[PDB]
Structures are given as structure tokens and as C-alpha cells.
Design an enzyme around this catalytic site. Sequence first.
Site, PDB file in Angstrom:
ATOM      1  N   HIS A  43      22.650  16.350  53.817  1.00  0.00           N
ATOM      2  CA  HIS A  43      22.420  14.919  53.484  1.00  0.00           C
ATOM      3  C   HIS A  43      23.406  14.011  54.244  1.00  0.00           C
ATOM      4  CE1 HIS A  43      25.092  15.320  49.707  1.00  0.00           C
ATOM      5  NE2 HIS A  43      25.747  14.613  50.614  1.00  0.00           N
ATOM      6  N   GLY A  71      32.078  10.233  48.601  1.00  0.00           N
ATOM      7  CA  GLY A  71      32.871  10.722  49.739  1.00  0.00           C
ATOM      8  C   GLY A  71      33.331  12.151  49.542  1.00  0.00           C
ATOM      9  N   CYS A 118      31.455  14.899  48.677  1.00  0.00           N
ATOM     10  CA  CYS A 118      30.425  15.820  49.234  1.00  0.00           C
ATOM     11  C   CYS A 118      31.049  16.681  50.347  1.00  0.00           C
ATOM     12  CB  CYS A 118      29.199  15.064  49.748  1.00  0.00           C
ATOM     13  SG  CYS A 118      28.731  13.598  48.779  1.00  0.00           S
TER      14      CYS A 118
HETATM   15  C1  LIG Z   1      28.941  12.252  49.683  1.00  0.00           C
HETATM   16  C2  LIG Z   1      30.206  12.486  49.808  1.00  0.00           C
HETATM   17  C3  LIG Z   1      28.314  11.163  50.480  1.00  0.00           C
HETATM   18  N1  LIG Z   1      29.268  10.261  51.129  1.00  0.00           N
HETATM   19  C4  LIG Z   1      29.490   9.010  50.699  1.00  0.00           C
HETATM   20  O1  LIG Z   1      28.898   8.519  49.742  1.00  0.00           O
HETATM   21  C5  LIG Z   1      30.542   8.173  51.436  1.00  0.00           C
HETATM   22  N2  LIG Z   1      31.285   7.386  50.463  1.00  0.00           N
HETATM   23  C6  LIG Z   1      32.605   7.187  50.523  1.00  0.00           C
HETATM   24  C7  LIG Z   1      33.186   6.252  49.508  1.00  0.00           C
HETATM   25  O2  LIG Z   1      33.313   7.746  51.360  1.00  0.00           O
HETATM   26  C8  LIG Z   1      29.918   7.235  52.490  1.00  0.00           C
HETATM   27  C9  LIG Z   1      30.949   6.560  53.369  1.00  0.00           C
HETATM   28  O3  LIG Z   1      29.005   7.974  53.303  1.00  0.00           O
END
Ligand SMILES: *C(=C)CNC(=O)[C@H](NC(C)=O)[C@@H](C)O
Lengths: 304, 304
Positions: A41, A143, A145
Site C-alpha cells: 500500500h 507512518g 506501516c
Molecule cells: C502507513 C504507515 C501509511 N503512511 C502514512 O500514513 C504516512 N503518515 C505519516 C504521518 O507519516 C504518510 C506520510 O504516507
Amino acid sequence: SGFRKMAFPSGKVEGCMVQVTCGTTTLNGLWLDDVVYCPRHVICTSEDMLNPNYEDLLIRKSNHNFLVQAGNVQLRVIGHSMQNCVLKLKVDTANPKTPKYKFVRIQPGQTFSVLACYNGSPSGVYQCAMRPNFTIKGSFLNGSCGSVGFNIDYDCVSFCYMHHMELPTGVHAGTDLEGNFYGPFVDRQTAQAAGTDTTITVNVLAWLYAAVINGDRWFLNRFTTTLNDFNLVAMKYNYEPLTQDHVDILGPLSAQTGIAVLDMCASLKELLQNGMNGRTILGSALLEDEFTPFDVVRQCSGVT
Amino acid sequence: SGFRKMAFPSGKVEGCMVQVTCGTTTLNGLWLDDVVYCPRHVICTSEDMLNPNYEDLLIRKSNHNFLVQAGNVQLRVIGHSMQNCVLKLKVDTANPKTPKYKFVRIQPGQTFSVLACYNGSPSGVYQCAMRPNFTIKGSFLNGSCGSVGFNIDYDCVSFCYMHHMELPTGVHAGTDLEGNFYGPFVDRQTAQAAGTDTTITVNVLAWLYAAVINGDRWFLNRFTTTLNDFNLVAMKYNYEPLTQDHVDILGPLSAQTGIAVLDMCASLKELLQNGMNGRTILGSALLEDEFTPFDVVRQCSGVT
Ligand SMILES: *C(=C)CNC(=O)[C@H](NC(C)=O)[C@@H](C)O
Ligand SMILES: *C(=C)CNC(=O)[C@H](NC(C)=O)[C@@H](C)O
């Protein structure tokens, strides 16, 4: 003495964490040898997440669209492939800090350490269990993930989890390092509900053994039971059935304490039926089920 | 979402752990630059521990009597000195993995990560608090002495604890890295009893804020209180007095949730008086006091 929810030392995994960016999406990757593993993803906008076609979205992506940063140095991506729900990015440099490692798919009830990461950087480490409904109760912000779960056996890191998803109930779902989700979950922003979060009975018994070893004994009763009698009460309290395999696994803790497994089952049966009456066991007011029998032996024997 | 008892990533401290042997006593040391820090009781037999004269025991010890092993390589000891309850062993090699570091003496209520070590090797990492009675509730077996407690601020490790002692009640005592015990404890095998282990009120309030942020809100009540009214009830339940300094420190969590600190005090007052009635908050059946306000902000914002 003392018994703590203890994680594996994280250093060996810290040395594997990188940042992966695809367009405007940033998350974490795991760099082992010349491959970076990350959730597929990474290629999605949050719009894409509502109903993504990953094969179609991936056609629009080249090696140079995957930005991989290890510390503050960029890695050159020379290849990419989708395996189930992970992307494997081939890079031109082997991770020099690659530990001995394995990929394992764990069973429900198994515990592991999570190294929570943001932008390829470690924020913290904590101990989790694969719930019987194949969720985990993590601590994961946007962030996070691509943060991974792992066990260590001496010098070998067994990677068992990669973080992908938060359900609307705020519990967590993810894949093994082959990209196969634990449980029925999909990497799509749709209604996914967890099943019954049952208690990991064999883990509670291990932790009751841990308590006896560390001097907490008030709950030891004068009773015994049978697996069938115990299991009738277990089912009523949304505890997993106890099998002879679980009894076998608790054998060493039984041996060390001289408390027959079925005696400890009868103690647990009374705790379920009577409650704690405002008492604590190893500083908990509820029965802890995120220590395996192997965890109790390890912590009680000081394995490194 | 989710809130876990989270330790600092341990890698930076793993790179500092060594084995120290003096005669038949083996424990852990911390190697920073060209100094190895370890408990001075490394020079004692368990016989010596009943009433040790450390200055007299140290006269019998030379540099070559302190065996320092980093991984499976011996370090050459070129100097030794006693500072309070620690020995500083000067070695001929700077630790190449020395992180940026500080020595800090923490206050009661402050939290830190412990890297439990045996024979200079990491076994696990967990989060502790300095109890108001200057004990900690650790997980420490024989051989764990010299294991350290730490906080990390970005790239700087602040070392606040070194493990020395288990009280007969199975709680733990130790020193800062200047070798000064927290609390009244001495490195002698004598009757030492801990004082009242009070609840760290400001930490419970921080964790109630953490709960509200993570969707656990059932305990929020329609009441407020005053510091004086709250504190009368706190004292009755062996909670630490809440000061305006604690209210100031909780300001950002108040701001983020829109719940006035004194409103959350009134919720905590009702929880103390009514109990949990079999309910849980962030998966706990008791009020957690080993998260600081700074810990809640850090974990809730994903600092690395
Ligand atoms: C899963 C970690 C998806 N990543 C995000 O939602 C990121 N969010 C942050 C706050 O880093 C985004 C920048 O892609
Ligand atoms: C504190 C860690 C003192 N060290 C010990 O008690 C050692 N015990 C074990 C099991 O390692 C002993 C060898 O000195």
C-alpha cells in the site's frame, strides 16, 4: 525476581529499518541483504485505499519511483516485485548490518516484539501477541506501516509480522514477511471487523507459573480439575480450549514449581469464577495472556 | 491508536554492554569511551556481601584482576577507581559504538528503559519507573547486576540507573552512573526494607489522558475538584500529592483533549472511590502510573 512484559533487545532490527517513499506515501521498510520489504500500500493514495487494484497501480511505478533512505543515505532500487501484500525492492547494496534471520508465520497465542518506526527511525519497542482473532493490540500511529514484529533465538532474528492496518476498533492487522495477512484482513480501507478476542489460556497458565516462581502464590487453591471440566468453564469465559499439547508445553514449569498443570487449571478456574477480589498477581488486576510458556522459561532463566 | 508500555530502542545501549569478572564474581559493565562502569560489589564474595569494607577489599585488587570482555574480545584494564558504589575501569580502547550520552540522576516518578543483561549480553528490554520509595520493580536474576536504565532524546542516551540489589521483598535498588544509590539503600546483604510504594498521581493522570486520546472514555465524569480536595482523597489512597507543577506538566495533554486537569482529577477521584467495577482502561484493570506526561506525548506523537 520480578516478572516484566519484556521485549527482545531491538538493536539487530534497528539496523534493518529504512524509509520507503512512493509519491506522497512514506512508511517503513525492512532491509535484509539487498532486498527492502514494505507494505504494497506504499503505492496508494488514501483515495486508492478505498478500493485499490494493486497490480494496476503497480504498472504506473518504476524502480526510480520507490525512494529508499537508510539513515540519511539513498539506496538505488534496481528491481521491484509484489509478493502477496508486500513489495520487495531489490537495491544495489546488501545491508551491512543484516543479522542472521528467518521469516516465520506464527500461530495465534504466539508473542513477539514490535519495533515501532516512523520515517525508517525507531520510536520504541514493546511485546505483543497474535490474538486468537489474528489481530494484535499494538501502538501504531500514521507512518508506522512496515514496522516489524520479531523473535530472537541467540543471534537469529525470526521476523513474524509487518504492520499494515488499523481496524476502525483501533486493533491492528498485518502480514508475515511473505506478505500474507494474519487472519481474513485485506489491505483496503473497508469495514473489517475482528472476531471474538478470546484469552490465550496456555499463556495465562504460564504467567500463573511465573507468579508462583516470583513469590505471588495467594491464588493457589486446594483443587484439581480435568481438561474437559476446565474447558467447559474456559468456554464460558471466552478462554481458548486447553489441549494436551498445551499441558505438554507447560511440563517444565510444572516440574520447576511442583504444581501439576491440572492443579494450576483448577486455580485459574477459581480465579475466573471468583475474580481477583481486588487482589493483584505480578502487579496485574487481570489475568495476563501475552507471555508464552517459552517466554516465562526464557525470562525466568535469563537467556541472552 | 493503541497505547503500549513501550521501551526505548535498545541498540545504542546494547553496543555498550560488557562482562566484568573479578575472581569468581561476574556481572555487567557499561563501556563508554575508554571507561567501563560496574557495581563495586564485583570485588565481593557473597560472604563479603554480609558486611563489606569496599576500600579494604579494593586494596587486594589490581588492574589485571578485573577481567573485561566485550563480545568475545578481552579489554586491557589500565586503571581502576571507586566512585561511590561504582567502579570505573579505564581500558586502553575507546568503545567504538559509544553513543552521545549523559549521566542523569532521575526523580521518583520518572520512567526509563532497562536493558536486562547477563554475562555482558542483552536478554530483554522493559520500561520501569523510579518508585516514590526509590525502588524499582524490575526483572533481574543473579548475574543481572550492572544492567542499566536509560532514556533516549533523539541520538543522546541519558543513563539514569545501574542495577545493584534485590531487597528480600523482591523489589530492586541501584545507583545513578555516579554510583549514588537511589534512596537509602546500601550495597550490603543486610535487612533493608522499602518505604510506602505510593502511586505516581501525575503519571496516572497522563495515562488517563492517553486513554481518552485512544478512545477509552467511559470513566470521564461530570465533576471537577480542586488540588486540595483531590489531595485529601489522594492521601487516603496512598497517591502522591498533586502540585501545580504537575498541573502545568499535564497542560499539553489538557489542551489536546480539551479536558481541564482538575476535571480529570475528579474522574480519577471517582475511580479511586468507586473502583473499576470490572471494567478496563487501555486493557488494564488498575490505574497505570509508569507513564510520564512526557511518555504519553512521545508515544502519542511518534517521536524517533
Ligand atoms: C502507513 C504507515 C501509511 N503512511 C502514512 O500514513 C504516512 N503518515 C505519516 C504521518 O507519516 C504518510 C506520510 O504516507
Ligand atoms: C550480580 C549480578 C552479581 N553476580 C552474580 O550473582 C553472578 N551470578 C550469575 C548467575 O551469573 C555470579 C557468577 O557472580
